[PDB]
Structures are given as C-alpha cells and as structure tokens.
Subunit: 437 residues, 3 copies
C-alpha cells in the first residue's frame, strides 16, 4: 500500500512572536467566574442551549460521513436473481427462458491509496467538526455570562434612576417650601419640576432595557425558569486572567477556530494524495458464484453451479489532462487552506491585543471617572448651599445634579465594559472549555 499525500508541515504563524503588553495556565472557568450565579446559568445553558445541541449533532454528522466514505475500502457482497425471456418477431424460433441467480464479491485493491486518503480527509474533517463544537461551547460560555452581567447592569441602572427621582423630588420640596415663603423665584421650581419629569422618562427607558435583557438571557439559557434578580454584592464577580511578563503568540495556536482551520488544512493534504493516486493504475478483484438454467425446476441443481474470479487492472493514458487539472484544484484549495489558517490566527492576535489594550484603557477611565464623581458631589453640595443663601441661581444646582446623574450612569457602564472585556480576554485565549484544573 502507498500514500501519495504530502507530509504535514504546520504553516508558520504570520504574527509577532509576542503581544506588546510565570506561565499562563487554563484554570477552569469555575476559577474565573467568581459569582456563583453565572456558574449556575452556564451549567443550565450547557444542557439546554439549542446552538450547542446543533454543534454536537454536526460532530455526529461528520463521524457518520467518515463511515460512509470508509466503506469503499472493504470487500462488498451482493446478490441478484433474474429471468430472461428472448424470442424473435417473425421467425417461429420458440421463445427462450433463462433463469439466473448470482452472488458477487467486489473489492478495490487501492494500491496507491486513493480511497485510503479520501477516508483520511474525512477523518480530519471530523476532527475539524469537534474543534468546531468546542468553539461553539466556549462562545456559549461567553454569551451566557455577558447576558447575565448585562441583565445586572439593567438592574443597577433602573435602581439608581429610581433613586435619583426620589432625590429630585426632595429638591422640588426644598424649592417648593422656599416659594411658599417668598425666598426664591418660581424659575427654580419649574427647573426642579423639569428634572422630575425628565427622570421619570429615564426610569421608563431603563425598565424596557431590563425587560429586554431578561428575554435575551432566557433565549441563551434555552429554559424559561425564574430569571436571576439583582445581586446585593457589587464587585469581585470575575477573577481576571494572570498573564506572564512576555506572552507568546503560540497561545493562539490552541484556539478552537484555529485548530479547526488546521484540521481542514490536513484534510486538504489528503485530498492532494487522492488527486495523485488518480494518475496510477487501479486493481479490482471480482469473484462470483452463479447458477443459470433453462427451466426453473432445476435452477438450484448440480450441473448449473458456476464460479468465477476476475482480477482487473485499469490504467489512465490520455484524459486531455483531466487528472492534471484535478491535481491543480487540490493543490490550489490546499493553499486556500493555508490562507484560511493564517486568517484565523491574525484575527485571533488582533482580538487579544485589543482586549489587553482595553484592560488598561478601561481601568484608567473608571478610576478617573470616580474622581470626577467625588468632585461632582462636592460641587452639588456647595451649589445647594450657596443657592440656599441667594449667592447663585438654581441653574448651578441643576447642572451639578445633571452631571452627577450622567457620571453615575457612565461609571455603571464602565465597570460593565471592564468585566465583559475580561471575559473577552478569557475567551480569546482558549476560554471556558475546561472547568477544573
């Protein structure tokens, strides 16, 4: 037996050896997700999400497809019966009757490994479909957690808007009482009435956001049981990934999408092997045991049984270069598989490089926003103080409250961005496949 396929070489990864930025290990996704709710929802989804269900069925499709293709490599047994009537149109020559029954055993030698390479291309494609399930798995893990964290964000935003509204209602009362007794103008009161109605809208928007974050969580879960409520604890929900000083691009090579591109690349080599076998001769055995007769009474008698054994070898000589062209197709597609591989790596490298950058951008953003917060709370208290003594008009109170609301909302969105980014680093690195080191 011969395999004409080429030896596998892994293409060199077309990315820097390092990200810009002791050893990175995959501690399970149980370490990463500190919050026990996201642990429970992942567990729930892992058994009910329809997309992961399709991904597993696709692995099964590919295993069955390998067994369909591998069957060709094995001997084959078939039986057939038949009557043959035969006469002339004018001549009185009586009409014949030929009864026949047969058992035939076919077998392709495959001395140059055409069928053997085609089964291997399908073996490799099954490995590809397995890594594809894994990629679907860790992306599921990502969507579930982000969906939960997004729901929580809706819970906070709704809650602080309710709280602002009660704050602005007290402001209106503060202004109301000084107008019953002539200290202020009525412009302050209409400014305070504005804020109340404005904030009322916001609460309506945030309720809608919360409704929609619930429905999206339940879609990804695949089950519709009671959605989680708001957590009373804030902070520490995620344990970020610890990265060594100089980190290697090689980490990307174990990603599921890249591994899946690697297995398809292997499958394309095997197809090159089958393309090349197409040039060489083929050897086919075909042995048979038949029994023919002229009346049905003696079909399975002694003088009728016959055996047969035919080895055959066929060779191609001139096909107007069909075999060439089909070899070029193979080799071109293989180069396509190389390109596809490179593409999966280069994007992989971008993604990670981005989240690393975002890690620092978002930290500094969030800390400087808290500082702007603290300064805004002092501004607001001073503005209320000086307005209560007639030193400044109420627009200074309005501005501070406004700025303060915007900043509280942005800080909430920021820590969200922060921990989703952290999830995104986890996932781009190989993600939530393993759950226990």
């Amino acid at each position: 037996c011969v395999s004409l396929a080429p030896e596998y070489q892994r293409p060199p990864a077309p990315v820097p050896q390092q990200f810009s930025l002791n050893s990175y290990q995959d501690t399970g996704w149980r370490n990463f997700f500190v919050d026990p709710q996201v642990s429970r929802l992942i567990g729930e989804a892992l058994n009910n999400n329809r997309d992961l269900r399709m991904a597993a069925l696709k692995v099964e499709e590919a295993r069955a497809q390998f067994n369909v293709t591998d069957a060709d490599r094995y001997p084959q047994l078939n039986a057939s019966s038949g009557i043959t009537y035969n006469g002339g149109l004018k001549g009185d020559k009586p009409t014949t009757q030929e009864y026949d029954a047969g058992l035939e055993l076919s077998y392709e030698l495959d001395f140059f490994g055409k069928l053997k390479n085609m089964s291997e291309a399908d073996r490799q494609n099954y490995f590809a479909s397995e890594e594809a399930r894994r990629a679907v798995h860790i992306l599921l893990v990502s969507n579930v957690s982000q969906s939960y964290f997004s729901q929580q964000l809706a819970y906070e935003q709704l809650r602080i808007a309710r709280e602002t509204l009660k704050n602005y209602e007290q402001s209106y009362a503060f202004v109301e009482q000084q107008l019953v007794t002539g200290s202020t103008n009525v412009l302050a009161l209409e400014q305070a009435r504005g804020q109340i109605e404005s904030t009322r809208a916001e609460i309506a928007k945030r309720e809608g956001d919360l409704a929609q974050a619930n429905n999206a969580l339940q879609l990804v879960l695949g089950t519709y049981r009671a959605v989680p409520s708001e957590k009373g604890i804030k902070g520490g929900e995620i344990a970020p990934v610890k990265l060594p000083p100089n980190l290697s691009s090689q980490i990307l090579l174990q990603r599921p999408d890249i591994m899946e591109a690697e297995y398809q690349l292997k499958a394309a080599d095997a197809n090159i092997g089958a393309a090349r076998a197409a040039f060489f001769p083929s050897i086919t055995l075909t042995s048979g045991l038949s029994s023919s007769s002229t009346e049905l009474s003696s079909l399975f008698t002694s003088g009728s049984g016959m055996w047969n054994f035919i080895p055959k070898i066929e060779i191609p000589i001139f096909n107007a270069g069909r075999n060439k062209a089909n070899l070029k197709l193979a080799e071109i597609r293989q180069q396509q598989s190389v390109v596809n591989y490179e593409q999966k790596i280069q994007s992989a490298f971008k993604d990670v490089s981005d989240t690393l950058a975002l890690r620092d951008s978002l930290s500094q953003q969030l800390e400087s926003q808290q500082r702007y917060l603290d300064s805004l709370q002092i501004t607001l208290q001073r503005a209320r103080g000086l307005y209560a003594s007639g030193a400044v008009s109420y627009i200074e109170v309005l501005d501070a409250e406004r700025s303060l609301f915007a900043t509280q909302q942005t800080i909430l969105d920021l820590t969200y961005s922060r921990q989703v980014n952290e999830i995104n680093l986890f996932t781009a690195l190989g993600g939530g496949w393993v759950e226990k080191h």
Copy 2:
C-alpha cells in the same frame, strides 16, 4: 408498495405557553396601516421589489426540482443505433459488420418506496420554499412601511430644525436691540450668535438624513417615481394589534419561518425513509425490441427483429456498513431539523415578548417626555422674562432653549420608535400576508 419513512410528529414547542403581557385574528394589512400612503407604496413594492421576485423564482426552482426527481418513478423509453466493425490484426479473418437498432423500456418497481420517499422530500421542500416566499413577503411589507415612516421622521426633524433656527434668530434680535441701547452685556449676544450657527449645522445634518431616507425608500420600492412628501396630518397612521388577555405561544407556530422549518423537518423524515429502503431489494423491469443484421441492406427486414424482457432483483448483503452509516446520517440530519425548528420558535417568542414590553416602555417614555416638554416651555418663558429684567443671566435662556430642542427631537424619535415597534409586533405575529 411500502413507505419506510416515519410518521410525522410535530415537536413540542420549547417556549412558555403564554406571553407575559377576545381572540386574535389577522385583519388584513389594510386595517393595520391607516395611512393611505403606506398602503400605496406597499402596492408599488409588491410588484417591483427584486427580493420578492427572487423569492418567487425560488419557489419555481423548487417545483421544477420536484419534477426532475419524480421522473425516476415512471417507465422510461430510449432508442439506440449502432454499427460494429470487428476484425483481426494478423489472422485473415474478414472484417465483420454488425448493424443494430434498439428500443428499450426501463422501469424501477420501487417496492419499498425509495424513489417515492425522495420525491416526497422534494415535495416537502417545495412547500418550504413557498413559506419562504411568504416570509420574504411580509418582511418586505415591514421594510417598506418602516422606510416610509423613517422618511417622514426625517421630514419632521428637518422642519422643526428650520423652525428652531428662526426662533434663535429672533432671540438674537431680542438681545441685539438691548445691546444697541446698553441694557445687557455682549456675552448674551455671542451666546445667541452661538446657537444660531449650531442650529445651522443641525439643519445640514437633517437634510443629509432626508436625502438618505429618500434613496432607501426608492431602493425598497424598486421604482424611482416621485417620493412622498411630508404629511400635514400627524397621528393615527397605524391601528395597533388588539391582543387577548392571555395570549398563546401557539400563534408563533403559523409564522412563515417556523412553518418553513417544519416543512424541512418533514422532508428529513422522507430522507430517512429512502435511507431505510436502501437496505431492501430492488426490482427492475427492462423490455426491449431490437433489430440486428450483418449487411445494412436488411436491417429493418423480417428475420432480424427480436424482443426481450428481463425482470431483475438485486439485494445488498455486505457493504461494510455503508447503508447503516447513510441511515445514521439521515437520522442525525433529521434531529438537526428538529433543532432548527426549536431555534426558530424560541427566537420568535423572544421577539414578540420584546415588542410587548417595548409597547409599554415606549408609551410611558413618550408621555413623561411630553410632560418634561411642557415644563421646559414654562422654564424658557420664565428665563426669558427674568433675563429681560436683569434677574438672571442669559445662560438660563440658553439652557432652556437647548433642553427644549433636545426634547423636541427625542419626542419625534420616540413616536417613531413607538409606531415601528407596533409594525414589529404585527409582523412577528404573522404579518402582512393577508390584506382582507
């Protein structure tokens, strides 16, 4: 004749029996779309949109594909002629001549329903393609209407921007005359000059928005006639869907995309039946009337005509488990069709749930925004009154006009969102198929 395909069972829908939230009926899209312009554009688009045309062609593809596959079930007739020359290379054996003409009639019995099941898979796939057209149809309706409503929004936003601009020019005058006569500061006047130039920029943005809304409305129409102008009447353009107290998820099951997933699920059962037939024997008839000769002179003479009749039965015995694996493939793919069905349902249920919630979220937003509006108009008149008497600086007028503009634009965007949401509920329920 036997059919090995399985009996159809509809998969139980993996969603709550009810949405959270007398009987819902599909009154035609003529009742839903109150505005007669959206009705007239829908008519134009129903006869000119290329995507709908492609969807209908895809239905015809599928009917032709069924006829190609059904042909195998019928007897087949073919003729063939031929001369055969035959001689030896060294041995003096005079070169022979065999003239032949023949007429053959082939016919697969299909006793176990292999070909019959494969034609049925293609029947089912044609029904699928019909539900697909329908889905493209109602989605066209949704895109046309939102496209028109979006244009109209662009018209309003542009118009009130122009109106604001004339307002702020008058403000500039109000301040300008008090500076010619020394009552105010020049800081007011640069603040008013500022607003004017700002608003001038906004008008440019909104004109751009109107231009692009026009082009998108003509793309979706597929005809490039005169686009609709702005409506003088505002309100009542849509008659929302009236929904019963407790509403059933079952409504989703008549959605085109879900029905299309169902027909494909039927087609996969048929393929399971063909997979199974592959194990059992096949019986093939093949009768023939030929005529051979050794000189062309007597090809169609009396002593040459011959007839033939060969029934044949072939059986598989050991294929190294190819038939098994091909059956596993069928069953696996069938489960894939079940999963695909469940996915279309779960999504559909999410969508509807979202618009129901959005229905309440958008009404309450819009009403509280109008109340902020009203309060802002009082604030502006009071800031303008107190500024004219030296009680507050002009920054209080600036803020009021600013907040007022912003709120007017949000209210415009809100009612848009409101009525597009309503369109979205219509469509997610079964939508603009019927107009009766």
Copy 3:
C-alpha cells in the same frame, strides 16, 4: 456542431439614467490619494493582505475547474489487462483461464453542443471570479485607507484632549490664585477640579481608541512593522472625484460586483444551452485494440491481436419529463441571474446617490461647525473676562469650555466623515483598480 444556448442580451438597467446631483475618467488611485503614507500602506497591503490572497487563489481554482470540465470534449485513451477464471461446481469441466489486454479510445461527438456549452458556463464563471478578485482588490484599498485615516483621527483626538487638559489645569490655577486671596468662592474651584478629572477620563478613552486603530491597521496590512505616527500637516490628503454636470448611471455597469453578476448571467445562458442539448441524440465513437489468449505464454503473439470500432447513437424518447423539468430549472435559474444582476445595480445606484448627498451634507455641517467654533471661542474669552471681574459666575466659563471641547471633537469627526465619504465615492465608482 450546434449551440442551443441563447444569444446574450444585457438586461436594461433598472435605475434612473442620471444621478440627481466634462467627462468622468479613472485617474489612478495614486492621484486620488494625495497623502504618500496611504499610498505606501496600500502597496504594503497589496502584497500581504490574506483576503486578496484568497481572492487570487479563487481565480486559480476557477481556471482549474474549467480544465476539469473541458476534458470531456477531447478523445480519451485507457488501457486495461485482466485474467478471467471460469469453472463448474460439480461438473468435472476443467477450469478455464482467459487472459486479456486492451487499449480503448473513447470520444463523445457532442453534435448539439452539450459539453461545449458546459465548458462555456465554466469559462464565464472564471471571468466571474476574476471580477470578484477585482472587487476584493478595490475593497482592500478602501479598507486600508479608511484604517489609516481612522488611525490619524485617533491621534488628533488624543492630542487635543491632552491639550485641553493643560488648558483646564491653567483654569484651575487661575481660580486657585483668586481663592488663596479671597476674591472668589470655592464653588469655582470645585468646578475647575471637575473639568480636570473629567478630561483625564477622556484621555484614557482616546488612548484606547488609538491602540485599537493601530491593531486594526496592522490586521489589514497583514504585516506588523512600525505603524505610522501622527501627521504634522493636516489637510489635502485626498483629491476628490471630479464629476460632470449630468452624470450617467452607466458608470455603475463597469463596477466589479455588477460585472461579476453579468458573467454569471452569461454562464446561466450556457447552462440553458446544455439543458436543451439534453433532448437531442448523442453520438459516441469507441475504437479498440485488444489481445486475448488462453495461456499467458502467447498473450502478445500473432493470432491474438484484434481491432474494434463501434459508433453508437442514443436518443431519448420518454423520460417522464425529466429533460423538460431540467430545462425549466435552467431557464428559471437564468431569470434568477437577471434578478441578481438588477439587484447589484439598484444597490450600487443607491450607494452613489448617498455619497453624493453626503458630499453636500458634510461640507455644510463642517462649515457651520467651524463658525460655531469661532463664536464659542469669543464666548469663552468673554465669560472668563466677566468672571474675573465678578459679573458672572464661573458656570458661564464652564459651559463655554464644555461647548468648545465638544465642538473641537465634532469638527475632527466631521472632516473624517468628509474624507471617508470621498473614498466611498471613489470606490463605489470603480475605485482603486488602476494606478
């Protein structure tokens, strides 16, 4: 030989003959891109981008696919040997042994142009893949330039945020010194402190934007060399497309995506021709030279060689309408190809009509925004002057500095939009194929 395929007619383009709005010419993308950096990065990308690499390999696939299909039109030569054993089960008939070797030359006539039309459909489909490469090429140009320009925007936004921050620190100093000596209140000082910390946040956000614009620029280049820094000069980086008074829709018809739809429309005609050939007879020649024997000793001897020559003609008569249904499928898919063609045109026409609109929308936006800028700078100076004399409170300075920062950022975003829009017009018209 006969071709049953139909004559090609180009479908009339279903769009206005004119865009609403001397002669347009495609000056190379070297004229359009004034900035030498974008020219140099395009060169680097044209030799390293993986997507253009894949588009090329797809053209090679298509040519190979044509040679696979074209082989059927030529005579074919094949050889085969074989031994045949033959015996009875119970009858004492000695077991036979028949040795054979053979050389067969097969040839399909194709009198009605079935194989010929099917090769032609694949010729057309290779032309299609060529136009697809071209589309991928000009889209590569568009992505490379917008990536660079986007990077530059990140650079400016970061820089003016750093500069605003030094400004607001000087404001804080200005306020600090009047509170050390009692002239003002402490509300001004906490207002200025706020602006400082706020702007500190913004700087953090702009640094993150810059990093991400670098990584996306390196992805599209396909090489990871030192990214370009900020340009000290601003302005004149692009030379817009000069457009004649009344411009014709016909310009669209040379777009790659539409040409690719056209070639596929041609390929569907050829398939109609093969569908119709299916009805007519087929004529096949098959000549042979074989040599058989009964013992291997004399396999290639004198009495064994035999020659052969069999012309055959096969006719379909009743196929339960398979050939008809296969013809309808062809014709239907051809109408599909027409519709696909129309769709590619109508979208092309929308796109161009949009960038033309946007050309005017963005120029006016940007011009009025500069005027608002100028007016805001006067407002700020006046607010600071009247605050320093006790005439207005500091909030008036706050507002002006705020309004001014927002307007500086929007003007930056605007000229960006302006020159990307211009790139988008170039590309929608045929774009960066020629230099």
